[PDB]
Coordinates of C-alpha atoms in Angstrom, one line a residue:
Chain A
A272 CA 64.2 61.4 -88.2
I273 CA 61.5 60.8 -86.0
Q274 CA 59.8 57.5 -85.6
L275 CA 56.4 56.3 -85.4
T276 CA 55.3 52.6 -84.6
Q277 CA 51.9 51.3 -84.2
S278 CA 50.7 48.6 -82.0
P279 CA 49.0 46.1 -82.7
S280 CA 50.0 45.3 -86.0
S281 CA 46.9 43.0 -86.5
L282 CA 43.9 42.9 -84.5
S283 CA 40.6 41.1 -84.2
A284 CA 37.4 42.5 -82.8
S285 CA 33.8 41.7 -82.5
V286 CA 30.8 44.2 -83.4
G287 CA 30.3 47.0 -80.9
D288 CA 33.6 46.0 -79.1
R289 CA 35.8 49.0 -77.8
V290 CA 38.7 48.9 -79.7
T291 CA 42.1 50.7 -79.0
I292 CA 45.0 50.8 -81.3
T293 CA 48.3 52.8 -80.1
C294 CA 50.9 55.0 -81.8
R295 CA 54.2 55.4 -80.2
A296 CA 56.9 58.3 -81.3
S297 CA 60.5 58.2 -80.3
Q298 CA 60.3 61.9 -79.8
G299 CA 57.7 63.8 -77.6
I300 CA 55.8 65.8 -80.1
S301 CA 53.1 67.9 -78.3
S302 CA 49.9 67.0 -80.2
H303 CA 51.0 67.1 -83.8
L304 CA 49.6 63.7 -84.6
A305 CA 46.8 62.3 -87.3
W306 CA 44.9 59.3 -87.6
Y307 CA 43.8 58.2 -91.1
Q308 CA 41.4 55.2 -92.1
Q309 CA 42.0 53.5 -95.2
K310 CA 39.6 50.8 -96.5
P311 CA 40.7 48.4 -99.1
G312 CA 41.1 49.8 -102.3
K313 CA 40.7 53.3 -101.4
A314 CA 42.7 56.4 -100.6
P315 CA 43.2 57.0 -96.8
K316 CA 40.6 59.3 -95.1
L317 CA 41.4 61.6 -92.3
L318 CA 39.8 60.9 -88.9
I319 CA 41.5 63.1 -86.2
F320 CA 44.1 65.9 -86.2
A321 CA 45.8 67.7 -83.3
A322 CA 45.8 64.0 -81.6
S323 CA 42.7 64.5 -80.3
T324 CA 40.0 66.6 -82.5
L325 CA 37.4 65.0 -84.9
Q326 CA 37.8 65.9 -88.4
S327 CA 34.4 67.2 -90.2
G328 CA 32.2 64.2 -91.4
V329 CA 33.6 61.4 -89.2
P330 CA 31.6 59.2 -86.8
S331 CA 31.6 60.1 -83.0
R332 CA 32.9 56.6 -82.0
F333 CA 36.5 57.8 -82.8
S334 CA 38.1 58.7 -79.6
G335 CA 41.1 60.8 -80.7
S336 CA 43.2 60.4 -77.6
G337 CA 47.0 60.6 -76.2
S338 CA 49.4 63.5 -76.1
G339 CA 53.1 63.7 -75.7
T340 CA 54.8 60.7 -77.1
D341 CA 52.0 58.0 -76.8
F342 CA 48.7 58.2 -78.4
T343 CA 45.5 55.7 -79.2
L344 CA 42.9 55.6 -81.5
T345 CA 40.0 54.2 -79.6
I346 CA 37.0 53.3 -81.5
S347 CA 34.0 52.5 -78.9
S348 CA 31.1 51.2 -80.8
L349 CA 32.7 49.1 -83.5
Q350 CA 30.9 48.7 -86.6
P351 CA 31.1 46.3 -89.6
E352 CA 32.2 48.9 -92.1
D353 CA 35.2 49.9 -89.9
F354 CA 37.1 47.3 -91.4
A355 CA 40.2 49.2 -92.8
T356 CA 43.7 49.7 -92.2
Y357 CA 44.7 52.4 -89.5
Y358 CA 47.7 55.0 -89.9
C359 CA 49.1 57.5 -87.6
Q360 CA 51.0 60.9 -89.0
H361 CA 53.5 63.4 -87.5
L362 CA 51.8 66.5 -88.6
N363 CA 54.9 68.4 -88.6
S364 CA 55.7 72.0 -89.5
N365 CA 59.1 70.8 -91.5
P366 CA 59.0 68.8 -94.5
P367 CA 59.9 65.0 -93.9
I368 CA 56.5 63.5 -92.6
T369 CA 55.9 60.0 -91.4
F370 CA 53.1 57.6 -90.7
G371 CA 53.3 54.7 -88.7
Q372 CA 53.3 51.0 -90.6
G373 CA 49.7 50.6 -89.5
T374 CA 47.4 48.4 -87.9
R375 CA 45.0 46.0 -89.9
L376 CA 41.4 45.8 -88.1
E377 CA 39.6 42.4 -88.9
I378 CA 35.8 42.0 -87.6
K379 CA 34.9 38.9 -86.0
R380 CA 31.5 37.9 -86.3
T381 CA 29.8 33.9 -86.0
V382 CA 30.6 31.1 -87.9
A383 CA 28.7 31.3 -91.5
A384 CA 29.7 28.2 -94.3
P385 CA 30.2 28.7 -97.5
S386 CA 28.1 28.4 -100.6
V387 CA 29.9 26.4 -102.9
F388 CA 29.7 26.4 -106.7
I389 CA 31.9 24.9 -109.8
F390 CA 32.4 26.2 -113.4
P391 CA 33.6 23.8 -115.7
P392 CA 35.5 25.5 -118.5
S393 CA 34.3 27.1 -121.8
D394 CA 34.4 25.9 -125.2
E395 CA 35.6 29.2 -125.8
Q396 CA 38.6 28.9 -123.6
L397 CA 38.8 25.0 -124.6
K398 CA 39.6 26.1 -128.1
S399 CA 42.7 27.8 -127.1
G400 CA 44.5 25.2 -125.8
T401 CA 44.5 25.2 -121.9
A402 CA 41.1 25.0 -119.5
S403 CA 40.5 26.3 -116.3
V404 CA 37.9 24.8 -113.7
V405 CA 37.0 27.2 -110.9
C406 CA 35.6 26.4 -107.5
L407 CA 34.0 29.1 -105.5
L408 CA 33.4 29.5 -101.9
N409 CA 30.8 32.3 -101.1
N410 CA 30.3 34.8 -97.8
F411 CA 31.6 32.5 -95.3
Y412 CA 33.7 33.4 -91.8
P413 CA 36.1 32.6 -90.8
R414 CA 39.0 32.9 -93.3
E415 CA 40.4 29.5 -92.7
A416 CA 39.0 26.9 -95.3
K417 CA 40.3 23.7 -97.1
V418 CA 39.5 23.2 -100.9
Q419 CA 40.9 20.2 -102.5
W420 CA 40.7 19.5 -106.0
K421 CA 40.1 15.9 -107.1
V422 CA 39.8 14.7 -110.7
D423 CA 38.5 11.0 -110.9
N424 CA 38.8 10.9 -107.2
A425 CA 42.5 11.6 -107.5
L426 CA 43.9 14.7 -105.6
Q427 CA 45.8 17.6 -107.5
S428 CA 48.3 19.7 -106.1
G429 CA 50.4 22.5 -107.6
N430 CA 48.1 23.7 -110.7
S431 CA 45.6 24.8 -108.2
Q432 CA 45.5 28.8 -107.2
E433 CA 43.4 30.1 -104.5
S434 CA 42.3 33.5 -104.1
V435 CA 40.1 35.7 -101.2
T436 CA 38.3 39.1 -101.0
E437 CA 38.7 41.6 -98.5
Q438 CA 36.4 41.1 -95.5
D439 CA 33.0 42.6 -96.7
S440 CA 32.0 46.2 -95.7
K441 CA 28.5 45.0 -95.1
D442 CA 28.4 41.6 -93.4
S443 CA 32.3 40.8 -92.8
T444 CA 32.3 37.7 -94.9
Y445 CA 35.3 36.4 -97.0
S446 CA 34.7 34.4 -100.6
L447 CA 37.4 32.3 -101.9
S448 CA 38.2 31.2 -105.5
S449 CA 40.3 28.4 -106.4
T450 CA 41.5 27.5 -110.3
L451 CA 42.6 24.4 -111.5
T452 CA 44.8 25.0 -114.7
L453 CA 45.4 22.0 -117.0
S454 CA 46.2 21.7 -120.8
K455 CA 43.6 20.3 -123.2
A456 CA 45.7 17.2 -123.2
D457 CA 45.8 16.4 -119.3
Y458 CA 42.0 17.6 -119.3
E459 CA 40.5 15.2 -121.4
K460 CA 42.3 12.4 -120.1
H461 CA 39.8 12.3 -116.9
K462 CA 35.9 12.5 -116.5
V463 CA 35.0 13.4 -113.2
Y464 CA 36.4 16.9 -112.0
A465 CA 35.1 17.6 -108.3
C466 CA 36.0 20.1 -105.8
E467 CA 35.8 19.3 -101.9
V468 CA 35.4 22.2 -99.7
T469 CA 36.1 21.7 -95.8
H470 CA 35.3 24.3 -93.5
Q471 CA 34.5 24.9 -89.7
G472 CA 31.3 26.1 -90.5
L473 CA 30.4 22.8 -92.2
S474 CA 29.9 19.7 -90.2
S475 CA 30.7 17.4 -93.2
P476 CA 33.3 18.4 -96.1
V477 CA 31.0 19.3 -99.1
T478 CA 31.8 18.4 -102.6
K479 CA 30.6 20.0 -106.1
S480 CA 31.7 18.3 -109.0
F481 CA 30.5 17.9 -112.8
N482 CA 31.4 15.7 -115.5
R483 CA 33.5 16.5 -118.9
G484 CA 31.3 16.8 -121.6
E485 CA 27.7 16.4 -119.9
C486 CA 25.0 18.6 -119.6
Chain B
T170 CA 83.9 106.9 -81.4
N171 CA 81.7 105.0 -79.0
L172 CA 80.4 101.3 -78.6
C173 CA 77.4 99.8 -80.1
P174 CA 74.5 98.8 -78.2
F175 CA 74.8 94.9 -79.0
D176 CA 74.0 94.0 -75.3
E177 CA 70.9 95.9 -75.6
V178 CA 69.6 93.8 -78.1
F179 CA 70.7 90.1 -76.9
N180 CA 70.3 91.0 -72.9
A181 CA 66.9 92.7 -74.1
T182 CA 63.6 91.5 -72.2
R183 CA 62.0 89.2 -74.9
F184 CA 62.1 88.8 -78.6
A185 CA 59.5 89.1 -81.4
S186 CA 57.9 86.5 -82.9
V187 CA 59.8 85.3 -86.3
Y188 CA 56.8 86.5 -88.5
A189 CA 57.2 90.4 -87.2
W190 CA 61.0 90.1 -86.4
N191 CA 62.6 93.4 -84.8
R192 CA 64.9 95.4 -86.9
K193 CA 67.6 97.8 -84.7
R194 CA 69.2 100.4 -86.8
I195 CA 73.1 100.7 -85.9
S196 CA 75.3 103.6 -86.8
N197 CA 78.0 105.7 -85.2
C198 CA 79.8 102.9 -83.1
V199 CA 82.6 100.5 -82.8
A200 CA 82.2 96.5 -83.4
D201 CA 83.5 94.6 -80.2
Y202 CA 81.8 91.3 -79.9
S203 CA 83.6 90.2 -77.1
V204 CA 80.5 92.1 -75.1
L205 CA 78.6 88.9 -75.9
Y206 CA 81.2 86.6 -73.7
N207 CA 78.4 86.2 -71.3
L208 CA 75.4 84.4 -72.2
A209 CA 74.1 80.9 -73.0
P210 CA 77.4 80.5 -74.7
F211 CA 75.8 81.8 -78.0
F212 CA 77.2 78.8 -80.1
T213 CA 75.9 78.9 -83.6
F214 CA 78.0 81.7 -85.5
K215 CA 78.5 81.5 -89.3
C216 CA 79.2 84.4 -91.5
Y217 CA 78.7 85.2 -95.4
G218 CA 80.4 87.4 -97.6
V219 CA 82.9 88.5 -94.7
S220 CA 85.3 86.8 -92.8
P221 CA 85.7 86.4 -89.2
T222 CA 88.2 88.7 -87.3
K223 CA 88.5 90.6 -90.6
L224 CA 85.7 92.5 -88.7
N225 CA 87.2 94.6 -86.1
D226 CA 89.6 95.8 -89.1
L227 CA 86.5 96.6 -91.3
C228 CA 83.9 99.8 -92.1
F229 CA 80.5 99.5 -93.7
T230 CA 77.8 102.2 -94.4
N231 CA 75.1 101.0 -92.2
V232 CA 74.7 97.8 -89.9
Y233 CA 71.4 96.2 -89.2
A234 CA 70.6 93.6 -86.1
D235 CA 67.2 91.4 -86.7
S236 CA 66.4 89.7 -84.1
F237 CA 63.6 86.9 -83.3
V238 CA 62.7 83.6 -82.0
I239 CA 62.3 80.4 -84.1
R240 CA 62.7 76.7 -83.1
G241 CA 66.0 74.7 -83.4
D242 CA 65.6 72.4 -86.0
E243 CA 64.4 75.7 -88.4
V244 CA 67.8 77.6 -87.5
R245 CA 69.2 76.3 -90.9
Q246 CA 66.8 78.5 -92.9
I247 CA 68.7 81.3 -91.6
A248 CA 71.4 81.6 -94.3
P249 CA 71.2 82.7 -97.9
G250 CA 69.2 80.8 -100.4
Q251 CA 67.2 78.9 -98.1
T252 CA 63.6 77.2 -98.4
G253 CA 61.0 76.2 -95.9
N254 CA 58.2 77.9 -94.2
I255 CA 60.7 80.2 -92.4
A256 CA 63.1 81.2 -95.1
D257 CA 59.8 81.6 -97.2
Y258 CA 57.1 83.1 -95.3
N259 CA 58.6 84.7 -92.3
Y260 CA 62.3 85.9 -92.6
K261 CA 64.3 85.8 -96.3
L262 CA 67.7 86.4 -96.4
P263 CA 69.2 87.6 -100.0
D264 CA 71.3 85.1 -101.9
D265 CA 74.3 87.7 -101.8
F266 CA 74.0 88.3 -98.2
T267 CA 77.2 89.7 -96.5
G268 CA 76.6 89.5 -92.8
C269 CA 76.6 87.2 -89.6
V270 CA 74.2 85.2 -88.3
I271 CA 74.0 84.0 -84.4
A272 CA 71.9 82.0 -82.3
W273 CA 71.7 80.5 -78.9
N274 CA 69.5 78.1 -77.2
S275 CA 66.8 79.9 -75.0
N276 CA 65.1 76.9 -73.6
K277 CA 65.6 78.3 -70.0
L278 CA 63.9 81.4 -70.9
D279 CA 61.2 81.2 -73.4
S280 CA 59.7 77.5 -72.4
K281 CA 56.7 77.4 -69.9
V282 CA 55.9 74.0 -69.1
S283 CA 51.9 74.9 -69.8
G284 CA 53.3 75.8 -73.2
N285 CA 54.6 79.0 -74.4
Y286 CA 51.9 80.2 -77.2
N287 CA 53.0 83.7 -77.6
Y288 CA 56.0 82.8 -80.2
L289 CA 54.3 82.7 -84.0
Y290 CA 55.2 82.2 -87.2
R291 CA 53.2 82.5 -90.7
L292 CA 52.1 79.3 -91.7
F293 CA 50.0 80.3 -94.8
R294 CA 51.0 82.6 -97.8
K295 CA 50.5 83.3 -101.3
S296 CA 54.1 83.9 -102.4
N297 CA 57.5 83.8 -101.0
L298 CA 59.0 86.7 -99.1
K299 CA 61.5 89.0 -101.0
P300 CA 64.5 89.2 -98.7
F301 CA 64.3 91.6 -95.7
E302 CA 60.6 91.7 -96.0
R303 CA 58.3 91.7 -93.1
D304 CA 54.5 90.5 -93.5
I305 CA 52.5 91.5 -90.5
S306 CA 49.0 91.3 -91.5
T307 CA 46.6 88.6 -89.7
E308 CA 44.4 88.6 -93.0
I309 CA 42.3 85.3 -93.3
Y310 CA 44.3 83.2 -95.9
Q311 CA 41.9 82.4 -98.7
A312 CA 42.9 78.6 -99.8
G313 CA 39.9 78.4 -102.3
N314 CA 38.3 80.7 -105.0
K315 CA 35.4 81.1 -102.8
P316 CA 36.6 84.3 -100.8
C317 CA 36.9 84.6 -97.2
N318 CA 36.5 87.8 -95.6
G319 CA 36.6 87.3 -92.1
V320 CA 35.1 84.0 -91.4
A321 CA 37.6 81.3 -90.4
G322 CA 36.0 78.3 -92.3
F323 CA 36.9 75.6 -94.8
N324 CA 39.3 77.2 -97.5
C325 CA 39.5 80.3 -95.1
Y326 CA 42.4 79.9 -92.8
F327 CA 43.9 82.4 -90.3
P328 CA 47.6 82.4 -91.1
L329 CA 49.7 81.9 -87.9
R330 CA 50.5 79.4 -85.5
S331 CA 51.7 79.4 -82.1
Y332 CA 55.1 77.4 -81.6
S333 CA 54.1 75.9 -78.2
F334 CA 57.5 75.8 -76.5
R335 CA 57.5 73.4 -73.9
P336 CA 60.8 72.6 -72.3
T337 CA 60.5 68.9 -72.1
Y338 CA 60.8 68.7 -76.1
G339 CA 63.6 66.8 -77.9
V340 CA 66.0 69.7 -79.1
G341 CA 64.9 70.3 -82.2
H342 CA 61.6 71.8 -80.9
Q343 CA 63.1 74.0 -78.4
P344 CA 63.2 77.8 -78.7
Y345 CA 66.5 79.5 -80.3
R346 CA 67.0 83.1 -79.7
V347 CA 68.4 84.6 -83.3
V348 CA 70.1 88.0 -84.1
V349 CA 71.1 88.6 -88.0
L350 CA 73.7 91.0 -88.5
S351 CA 73.3 92.7 -92.0
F352 CA 76.8 94.6 -93.1
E353 CA 75.7 97.0 -95.7
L354 CA 78.5 99.1 -97.9
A355 CA 77.7 106.7 -98.6
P356 CA 80.2 107.7 -95.7
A357 CA 81.3 104.5 -93.4
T358 CA 79.8 105.0 -89.7
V359 CA 80.3 101.3 -88.2
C360 CA 83.8 100.0 -87.5
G361 CA 85.7 97.7 -85.2
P362 CA 88.2 98.6 -82.7
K363 CA 91.1 98.1 -84.8
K364 CA 89.7 101.1 -86.6
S365 CA 88.6 103.5 -83.7
Chain C
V145 CA 35.3 68.9 -103.2
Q146 CA 37.4 66.5 -105.0
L147 CA 40.9 65.5 -106.3
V148 CA 41.2 63.1 -109.3
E149 CA 44.5 61.9 -110.7
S150 CA 45.5 60.0 -113.9
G151 CA 48.9 59.2 -115.8
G152 CA 50.1 55.9 -114.3
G153 CA 50.3 52.6 -115.7
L154 CA 53.5 50.3 -117.1
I155 CA 56.7 51.7 -118.0
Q156 CA 60.3 50.1 -118.5
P157 CA 62.9 50.5 -115.7
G158 CA 65.0 53.5 -116.4
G159 CA 62.1 55.0 -118.1
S160 CA 59.8 57.8 -117.6
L161 CA 56.3 59.1 -116.6
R162 CA 54.3 61.8 -115.7
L163 CA 51.4 61.8 -113.3
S164 CA 48.9 64.6 -112.8
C165 CA 46.1 65.2 -110.7
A166 CA 43.4 67.9 -111.2
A167 CA 41.6 69.8 -108.4
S168 CA 38.0 70.8 -107.3
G169 CA 37.3 73.1 -104.5
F170 CA 40.5 74.7 -104.3
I171 CA 43.3 76.3 -106.2
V172 CA 46.6 74.3 -105.7
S173 CA 48.6 77.5 -106.4
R174 CA 47.3 78.3 -102.8
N175 CA 47.9 75.4 -100.8
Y176 CA 50.8 72.8 -99.9
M177 CA 50.3 69.7 -101.9
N178 CA 52.0 66.2 -101.3
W179 CA 52.6 63.0 -103.4
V180 CA 52.5 60.0 -101.2
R181 CA 52.9 56.6 -102.5
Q182 CA 51.8 53.1 -101.2
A183 CA 54.0 49.8 -102.2
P184 CA 51.7 46.8 -103.0
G185 CA 50.4 45.7 -99.8
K186 CA 53.0 47.9 -97.9
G187 CA 52.5 51.1 -95.8
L188 CA 52.6 54.8 -96.7
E189 CA 55.5 56.6 -97.9
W190 CA 55.9 60.5 -98.3
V191 CA 57.4 61.2 -101.9
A192 CA 57.3 65.0 -102.6
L193 CA 55.9 68.6 -101.3
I194 CA 55.4 71.7 -103.1
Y195 CA 54.8 75.0 -101.2
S196 CA 52.3 77.5 -102.1
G197 CA 55.4 79.7 -102.8
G198 CA 56.8 76.9 -105.0
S199 CA 59.5 75.4 -102.4
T200 CA 59.8 71.7 -103.5
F201 CA 61.0 69.0 -100.9
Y202 CA 61.4 65.1 -101.8
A203 CA 62.1 61.8 -100.2
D204 CA 65.5 61.0 -100.6
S205 CA 64.3 57.5 -102.3
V206 CA 63.5 59.9 -105.3
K207 CA 65.4 63.0 -104.9
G208 CA 66.9 64.2 -108.5
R209 CA 64.7 61.7 -110.3
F210 CA 61.3 63.2 -109.3
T211 CA 60.1 66.7 -110.1
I212 CA 56.6 67.8 -108.7
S213 CA 55.3 70.7 -110.8
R214 CA 52.1 72.4 -110.9
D215 CA 50.0 74.3 -113.5
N216 CA 48.3 77.4 -111.8
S217 CA 46.1 77.7 -115.1
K218 CA 44.5 74.2 -115.5
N219 CA 44.6 73.9 -111.7
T220 CA 46.4 70.8 -111.8
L221 CA 49.3 69.2 -109.8
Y222 CA 51.9 67.0 -111.8
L223 CA 54.7 64.5 -110.9
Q224 CA 57.2 63.9 -113.3
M225 CA 59.2 60.7 -112.7
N226 CA 62.5 60.0 -114.6
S227 CA 65.3 57.3 -114.3
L228 CA 62.6 55.3 -113.1
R229 CA 64.2 52.5 -110.8
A230 CA 61.8 49.2 -110.4
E231 CA 61.2 49.7 -106.7
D232 CA 58.6 52.9 -107.7
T233 CA 56.0 50.6 -108.4
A234 CA 53.1 51.7 -106.3
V235 CA 49.9 53.3 -106.0
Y236 CA 50.3 57.3 -106.3
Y237 CA 48.0 59.6 -104.4
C238 CA 48.3 63.1 -104.7
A239 CA 46.5 65.2 -101.4
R240 CA 45.9 68.8 -100.1
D241 CA 47.9 69.5 -97.0
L242 CA 46.9 71.7 -94.2
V243 CA 50.1 71.4 -92.3
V244 CA 48.9 71.3 -88.5
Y245 CA 45.5 69.9 -89.7
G246 CA 46.3 67.2 -91.5
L247 CA 46.1 66.1 -95.2
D248 CA 42.3 66.3 -95.3
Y249 CA 41.4 65.6 -99.0
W250 CA 43.1 62.9 -101.2
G251 CA 43.0 61.5 -104.8
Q252 CA 41.6 58.1 -105.6
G253 CA 45.0 56.4 -106.6
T254 CA 47.0 55.8 -110.0
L255 CA 49.3 52.6 -110.2
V256 CA 52.5 53.2 -111.7
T257 CA 53.9 50.0 -112.4
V258 CA 57.7 49.7 -113.6
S259 CA 58.7 46.5 -115.2
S260 CA 60.6 45.5 -118.2
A261 CA 57.5 43.1 -119.4
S262 CA 55.0 43.7 -122.0
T263 CA 51.6 44.6 -121.9
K264 CA 48.9 42.0 -122.6
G265 CA 45.5 41.9 -122.8
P266 CA 43.1 39.5 -121.0
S267 CA 41.1 37.3 -122.3
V268 CA 37.5 36.4 -121.0
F269 CA 35.6 33.2 -120.3
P270 CA 31.9 32.8 -119.1
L271 CA 31.2 30.9 -115.9
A272 CA 27.7 29.5 -116.7
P273 CA 25.5 28.9 -113.6
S274 CA 24.5 25.4 -112.1
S275 CA 21.7 24.2 -114.3
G276 CA 17.5 29.0 -104.6
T277 CA 20.1 31.3 -105.7
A278 CA 22.5 30.1 -108.4
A279 CA 25.7 31.5 -109.1
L280 CA 27.7 32.5 -111.9
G281 CA 30.4 34.7 -113.3
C282 CA 33.5 35.5 -115.6
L283 CA 37.0 34.6 -115.8
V284 CA 39.9 36.8 -117.0
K285 CA 43.0 35.1 -117.8
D286 CA 46.6 36.2 -118.7
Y287 CA 46.9 39.7 -118.8
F288 CA 49.5 42.4 -117.7
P289 CA 49.8 45.0 -115.8
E290 CA 47.7 45.7 -113.1
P291 CA 44.8 46.5 -113.1
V292 CA 41.5 45.7 -115.0
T293 CA 37.9 47.3 -114.1
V294 CA 35.1 44.7 -114.0
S295 CA 31.2 45.6 -114.1
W296 CA 27.9 43.5 -114.2
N297 CA 25.8 44.9 -116.6
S298 CA 27.6 48.1 -116.7
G299 CA 27.0 49.1 -113.0
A300 CA 23.2 47.8 -112.7
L301 CA 24.1 44.6 -110.8
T302 CA 26.2 45.6 -107.7
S303 CA 24.9 43.6 -104.5
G304 CA 26.1 40.2 -103.8
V305 CA 29.0 40.8 -106.3
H306 CA 32.4 39.7 -105.6
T307 CA 35.4 40.4 -107.6
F308 CA 38.7 38.7 -106.5
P309 CA 42.1 39.7 -106.4
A310 CA 44.2 38.9 -109.3
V311 CA 46.5 36.1 -108.7
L312 CA 50.2 36.1 -110.7
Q313 CA 50.2 32.6 -112.6
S314 CA 53.8 31.1 -113.0
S315 CA 53.5 32.6 -116.7
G316 CA 54.3 36.1 -115.1
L317 CA 50.5 37.0 -116.1
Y318 CA 47.7 38.1 -113.6
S319 CA 44.1 36.2 -113.9
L320 CA 41.2 37.0 -111.8
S321 CA 37.6 36.1 -111.7
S322 CA 34.6 38.1 -111.1
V323 CA 31.0 36.2 -109.7
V324 CA 27.5 37.2 -108.5
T325 CA 24.8 35.4 -107.0
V326 CA 21.3 35.7 -108.4
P327 CA 17.8 34.2 -107.8
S328 CA 17.6 30.7 -110.0
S329 CA 14.2 32.4 -110.9
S330 CA 16.0 34.6 -113.5
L331 CA 18.5 32.7 -115.1
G332 CA 16.5 32.3 -118.3
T333 CA 14.8 35.8 -118.8
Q334 CA 17.4 38.2 -117.2
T335 CA 20.5 38.6 -119.3
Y336 CA 23.8 38.7 -117.7
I337 CA 27.0 40.2 -119.2
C338 CA 30.1 41.3 -117.6
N339 CA 32.1 44.3 -118.8
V340 CA 36.1 44.3 -118.7
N341 CA 38.0 47.4 -119.0
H342 CA 41.7 47.0 -119.7
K343 CA 43.0 50.5 -119.9
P344 CA 47.1 49.3 -120.1
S345 CA 46.5 47.5 -123.7
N346 CA 43.2 49.4 -124.4
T347 CA 41.1 46.3 -124.3
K348 CA 37.4 46.8 -123.5
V349 CA 35.5 43.6 -123.9
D350 CA 32.2 42.4 -123.0
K351 CA 30.9 38.7 -123.5
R352 CA 27.5 36.9 -121.9
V353 CA 26.8 34.1 -119.6
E354 CA 24.3 31.8 -120.4
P355 CA 23.6 28.1 -119.1

């Protein structure tokens, strides 16, 4: 049936900027269109319906614009919390309702380098049969950060496994979690366990390390 | 035996909104359909419980011509045993319907470029319509347990919507005048030419 | 005011499952109600629709296997799912529909995850802080399927916490890790413990974090 396409797919913008997302329909539908906001891990929230009118309970910096076959959501005074994925919908009177594929809106901010931390396994865990070292990079920007595990200054690959948060609603900062996983055999074969963070907000790669069976 | 005022139903000025459909009663006349040759050539024509060309050679007690405007993509619901907001809250044919359905594009007739907000359909209704039932009320629809009584508000919705017929639209969205002939078989008073 | 749903989880391929979403502020027997699903990290996909007068409609991808019901008495809407193929894995949302005015109220989500794999509770291991602001937390290893719920002091500690997206180890098992930054001046007096609920296996587990 009708087809809805949003542009752009991804989008980065700085607080206070006027941002415009667009929704294009492959058929002129008069003003039967709704805009939805979906913050991560949450249901979507209706912002705009009738393609221009503002739903109740929604901030006024949301311009419902467009008509005919091309529409734009314009947020004017961009805000940190307004990081979400933005969807448009065909408000059709007949069943098969369709949404756009969505736009991911990422906030831009100033460089902030990560607090680094490192957590040797638990004797609890060691009693099981594997061990799990864990490095952590807290509250930084931008996403792009290099984490290098070193084990007696020998670099490890393959057993690492990173993981990132969603940009923060309050401050727009990511946090990262690396996890080196070795059997207790390979674990006791080494003494120094280090984690070396290279980031743009750091002038020199920070390291945080411990020693097996110490402190 | 005289002719039937079909041309008076089609060549008729304008049609009712689907929710409040017209029904002209027909009795004492002859079923000649070549009258309809001339119009926007009236292309969509399907019958149920009766065969085409067996019509000029049949007789029924009473005959009804229901008329209304709907948008094109919704014409598939004017048929027995359909669902959709039209087949359910505006105009329902019975499952055993015997009769014919006729529909022509009226984009040239009922589309203002400013938008024709005169054609209306019921959007909100508690229950389905019984076949050949008409709901005219514009009572405020109570979507919550909290009663509405006049105020259009949250969980208090007025139940009709304009069709907004614009000539630009993709053809699914364009107006269609529709006439539904109900063939009901008392002494018979509506027959075809081959029985005059 | 509210729409609250329940009934998803792990289930084999070909199996069957019945979601249910219950309503506050409006009777479902009076409104157009929808089930919309969202595949993991994919977009939105409409799935079923029930009219106030009971007429149902389905997306082809689910036609003839799903059946969207309701119960006027309990004021609740259902979604019975049979012949469950594996592609059906997603978050399932119910929603109230005001057709021309949009879907104004939504549920919270329930995750139907359809895999031939076997449920498996996690295990929790502490992350003792570095003996300014000293960070500490919990690890949660080798469980299935998603998700797990993680709280710090049963909802007390909420600022500066970050819980990480589960990663899928080569062992086909998830493992994630929650952390918080607290003042260095509280690590010996204040007692910190994370709470892990894993509904899919009935695995509720608490464990303290000490230097």
